[PDB]
Amino acid sequence: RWRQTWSGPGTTKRFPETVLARCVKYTEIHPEMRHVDCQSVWDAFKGAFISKHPCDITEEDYQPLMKLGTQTVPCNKILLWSRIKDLAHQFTQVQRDMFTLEDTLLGYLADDLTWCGEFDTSKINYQSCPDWRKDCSNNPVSVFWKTVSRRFAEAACDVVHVMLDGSRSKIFDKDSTFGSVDVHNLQPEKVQTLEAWVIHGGREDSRDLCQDPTIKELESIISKRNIQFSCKNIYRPDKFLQCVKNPEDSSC
């Protein structure tokens, strides 16, 4: 109508068929995911939020889905990222030097989608879904990404990398999922170093954003957990992706 229940956009159109097709396509491509039954995955995904109030979702709601989506990722090749999606994916696409949450079955299923249900019924709400800020944080989409981001950070070991958007006013944002979940769920016993790549947005090689106050906050939080912190500027992200493509690439 002219007034919806919630402030967020409604469930993505054909959400069930989309998630199911994504699960088929993923499990056709990635061999270690062939034990996976896609119907079972869809059932467990729906079970997490159908007939539930979309402001009352918990991590336990998603545990069936997580169990079914159990997947080993090489623990020393994890790339976290915050607010700079395209480059993180273009980078891992070149030769799978690293793995992001969207390279995992569950991350691939949900990327770019929105979903919610209703307390009273088993219908998907295609009209509107809770906004994290205005309506509630414990909504189906936010709780899903907290839960999966928590388990992905827990699986990391050795050197873990994070790409950060250096054109935001908060390069490191303590309120982002990276700042509120990932940094606190790396296991210090297993993780030697968190290495941030701060992605520049223009000019080229301007300031040294590894000196930015928020990066200094990040370094102190990480160092206080007994994990070493490293930071690198990527001044020209275009030149960086071409260098990744053209190994022994005459400047890379």
Ligand SMILES: N=c1c2ncn3c2ncn1[C@@H]1O[C@H](COP(=O)(O)OP(=O)(O)OC[C@H]2O[C@@H]3[C@H](O)[C@H]2O)[C@@H](O)[C@H]1O
């Ligand atoms: N792939 C998505 C995604 N695709 C669309 N969206 C995604 N949220 C998180 N993820 C992944 O979870 C991670 C944590 O997300 P967060 O930083 O909270 O997203 P924010 O920068 O806070 O963006 C969150 C918003 O963007 C929508 C969600 O429907 C919505 O919540 C992201 O870095 C990304 O890896």
